[PDB]
């Protein structure tokens, strides 16, 4: 895939640095196209950093902060458009690359860089850095307002080499004879907001950003609006003409494109667009191929549990017991969840309790999440994460730090016992610091995660050599040693059978305490009045027809503990009486009345 | 305020069976993690068995699996142990405690089973 | 199994002594161990928990050291009430162990 998220962690420091770079890693591996900001901080000297190669187009901003690696390779990166701003001001943010050999920054290497549609520059305190001066940024910006949103500052601490002798006038990214900044706006004829050079024959179509290869809507580097299968438009396709041209039918939009139908995860909108949240008035409805719609509501719309970042929650940074009864008897929470040491320690500031572990118990319910779920502290009490026992899926429509759907450190809960949880919509899974907990390495994650550029991060838990013995390790009966717990209740398959939630060896089909007959790999009882059998099955379902034989009498096609004494299967019906046989099959009564009749007769009719 | 008060120990023939109680207060048995624990008279500590009821993981010592079964009423908020088969070196007072951190915390004032004729 | 070892069986201190009593685990049992104080027919109460915190309401005098796998409950300066058996446990591996304990008397 092609386009990927971005995060949103500002100048934040790392939550586990052991594992940031692999989050950036993964994150980025082969996209092109950045839906939100590239926030490439805190990258260590030797940084293997190859993986961002590809990165062609950023949504929102472009944030190189606190970093000592001294180059990041963004050479193939053709335009920022700002749809998000850091500081509320800026598209490109270079700031602290080095301490106030030598670590830092060195040379800015976007060689390619020649449209930023919004917002201004800020470059500041990167000692090492040369030849963000020499960069003519006007050309750059999209207006020229964008000027006056420009602070670039120069103070370094060495004495820079001059541009390549092949560069045009003295502009460049770096040393390099293909580092000359590319001028693609104040170079060019006439009208034309870009050209290719300064001949009106070298403006590039109305529907280009960053320059173009020639003058048709296709030749465009960047599409200024939206890219409709190699063509840029001003619009996502009411007819007026009496005909039917290609290019198929209409299309969604999605992120800076129209597409024929919206990304995986995503939720097509009556308006025409992809999106991750619906607005008002609106449901969300699941046809049968697993796709999802934002819908009006026909009748006003039915009650909604709303998770953190969503509506009165918005704000609401963690789960408290100011708000966890909120989320009482919720199958659906339509938001995030987060866990923090504020949830259990409780603000004493405000008049605010710490809450109780035994409170926890609303989220029994809980099947599905569409945000996040985020545990950075935990009852002591409580072993493992059972609360969330029937929790499916973890949509990850809103990502932890813009990255993370599934976040579980600091803990020490022995095992996890997520055992319904079946799929993480997108979005990585950390799991670090929890020193005490095994199970991490026992769960297909493979299996949860839908898109192949999803991953577990994991580091500073129990040791997976040393999750080995019983209650450590998968129980025999887990089927491809996969489980999320010890034990025969904690299996994600079943090897043999199911009896309720656990793995068993053998149904009692042949023999045993109560009979059994098996439905879909599930044991199940018998109806009480079937005669158990000699090494035979004894009975096929559980209903009371379906026996070998009866334990007491029958009546047709019934296994019964007595027959029937004046029982009216339903009104209007005349009560039906009857008596045993020598075998044990129940007879019909004979002429009514007078003798009422059972086995030998009785009046009083 | 977190209080573990158990019942159901006494005196049993051998072979015979009994039935202990460990009722919780302050807390939910059924999230929590439970454990047994017994001591001879004139002995050391010795874990029995063990539950974390919500997770379904039940947990015997070799020297009592086959002959004790572990089990919690969530509606009560009570842990169970039932024993089968008693014999002469099961007369024991036997605690119930309360899995925390890394340890048990809170514990049940113990009962005494003795195992006669 | 796993095997916690107790040192010494029993040992007798003054007032106001340093009492240390050690507890050696077979394996590495990592930092998961815990300290026991049994006065004679009642619950044990806990000390320390994951070697060296102590629990909520333990007085000072009770603390507790890891070297390698080499526990050590240490009484600063022991008092009356003191005497008790006290025992390590392991929690590490599973099933969790206890060691044998340790008998502390009053010299008066």
């Known amino acids: 895939t092609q386009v990927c998220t971005g995060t949103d962690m500002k100048l934040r420091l790392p939550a586990s640095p052991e594992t940031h770079l692999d989050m950036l890693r993964h994150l980025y591996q082969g996209c092109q196209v950045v839906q939100g900001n590239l926030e490439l901080t805190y990258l260590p000297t030797n940084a293997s950093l190859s993986f961002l190669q590809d990165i062609q187009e950023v949504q929102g901003y472009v944030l190189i902060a606190h970093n000592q690696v001294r180059q990041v390779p963004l050479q193939r990166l053709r335009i920022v458009r700002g749809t998000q701003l850091f500081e509320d001001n800026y598209a490109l943010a270079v700031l602290d690359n080095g301490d106030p050999s030598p670590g830092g920054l060195r040379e800015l290497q976007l060689r390619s860089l020649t449209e930023i549609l919004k917002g201004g520059v800020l470059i500041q305190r990167n000692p090492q850095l040369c030849y963000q001066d020499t960069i003519l940024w006007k050309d750059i910006f999209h207006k020229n307002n964008q000027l006056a949103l420009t602070l670039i500052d120069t103070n370094r601490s060495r004495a820079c080499h001059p541009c390549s002798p092949m560069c045009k006038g003295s502009r460049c990214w770096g040393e390099s004879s293909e580092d000359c900044q590319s001028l693609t706006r104040t170079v060019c004829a006439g009208g034309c907001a870009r050209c290719k050079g300064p001949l009106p024959t070298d403006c590039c179509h109305e529907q280009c950003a960053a320059g173009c290869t020639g003058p048709k809507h296709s030749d465009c580097l960047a599409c200024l609006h939206f890219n409709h299968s190699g063509i840029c438009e001003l619009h996502c396709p009411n007819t007026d003409t009496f005909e039917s041209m290609p290019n198929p039918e209409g299309r969604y939009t999605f992120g800076a494109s129209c597409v024929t139908a919206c990304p995986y995860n995503y939720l097509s909108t009556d308006v025409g667009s992809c999106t991750l949240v619906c607005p008002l008035h609106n449901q969300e409805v699941t046809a049968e191929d697993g796709t999802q719609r934002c819908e009006k509501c026909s009748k006003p719309c039915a009650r909604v549990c709303y998770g953190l970042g969503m509506e009165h929650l918005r704000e609401v940074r963690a789960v408290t017991s100011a708000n966890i009864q909120e989320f009482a008897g919720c199958k659906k929470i339509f938001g995030s969840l987060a866990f923090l040491p504020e949830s259990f320690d409780g603000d004493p500031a405000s008049n605010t309790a710490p809450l109780q572990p035994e409170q926890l118990q609303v989220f029994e319910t809980l099947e599905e999440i569409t945000g996040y779920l985020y545990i950075s502290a935990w009852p002591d009490s409580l072993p493992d994460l059972s609360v969330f026992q029937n929790l499916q899926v973890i949509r990850g429509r809103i990502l932890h730090n813009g990255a993370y759907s599934l976040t579980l450190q600091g803990l020490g809960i022995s095992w996890l016992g997520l055992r319904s949880l079946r799929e993480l919509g997108s979005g990585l899974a950390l799991i670090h610091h929890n020193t005490h907990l095994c199970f991490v390495h026992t769960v297909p994650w493979d299996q949860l995660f839908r898109n192949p550029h999803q991953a577990l991060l994991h580091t500073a838990n129990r040791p997976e050599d040393e999750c080995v013995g019983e209650g450590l390790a998968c129980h025999q009966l887990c089927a491809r040693g996969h489980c999320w717990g010890p034990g025969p209740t904690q299996c994600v398959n079943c090897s043999q059978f199911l009896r309720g939630q656990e793995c068993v060896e053998e149904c009692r089909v042949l023999q045993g305490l109560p009979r059994e007959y098996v439905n879909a790999r599930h044991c199940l009882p018998c109806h009480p009045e079937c005669q158990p059998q000699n090494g035979s099955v004894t009975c096929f379902g559980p209903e009371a027809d379906q026996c070998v034989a009866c334990a007491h009498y029958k009546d047709p096609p019934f296994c019964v503990a007595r027959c029937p004494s004046g029982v009216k299967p339903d009104l209007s019906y005349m009560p039906i009486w009857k008596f045993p046989d020598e075998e044990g099959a129940c007879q019909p009564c004979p002429i009514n009345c007078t003798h009422s009749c059972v086995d030998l007769d009785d009046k009083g009719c | 305020e977190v209080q573990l008060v158990e019942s159901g120990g006494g005196l049993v023939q051998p072979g015979g069976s009994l039935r202990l109680s460990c009722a919780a207060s302050g807390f939910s048995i059924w999230w929590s993690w439970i454990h047994w624990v017994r001591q001879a008279p004139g002995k050391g500590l010795e874990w029995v068995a063990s539950?974390?009821?919500?997770?379904?993981?039940?947990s015997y010592a070799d020297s009592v699996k086959g002959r004790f079964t572990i089990s919690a009423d969530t509606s009560k908020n009570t842990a169970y142990l039932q024993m089968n088969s008693l014999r002469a070196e099961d007369t024991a007072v036997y605690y119930c405690?309360?899995?925390?951190?890394?340890?048990?915390?809170?514990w049940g004032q113990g009962t005494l089973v003795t195992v006669s004729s | 199994d796993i095997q916690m070892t107790q040192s010494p069986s029993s040992l007798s201190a003054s007032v106001g002594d340093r009492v240390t009593i050690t507890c050696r685990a077979s394996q590495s049992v990592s930092s998961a161990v815990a300290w026991y104080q049994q006065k004679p027919g009642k619950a044990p109460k806990l000390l320390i928990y994951?070697?060296?915190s102590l629990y909520s309401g333990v007085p000072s005098r009770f603390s507790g050291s890891r070297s390698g796998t080499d526990f050590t409950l240490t009484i600063s300066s022991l008092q009356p009430e003191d005497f008790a058996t006290y025992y390590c446990?392991?929690?590490?591996?599973?099933?969790?162990?206890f060691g044998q304990g340790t008998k502390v008397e009053i010299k008066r």
């Open positions: 994951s070697a060296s």
């Open positions: 539950i974390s009821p919500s997770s379904g993981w039940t």
């Open positions: 446990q392991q929690w590490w591996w599973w099933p969790s162990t």
């Open positions: 405690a309360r899995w925390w951190s890394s340890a048990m915390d809170y």
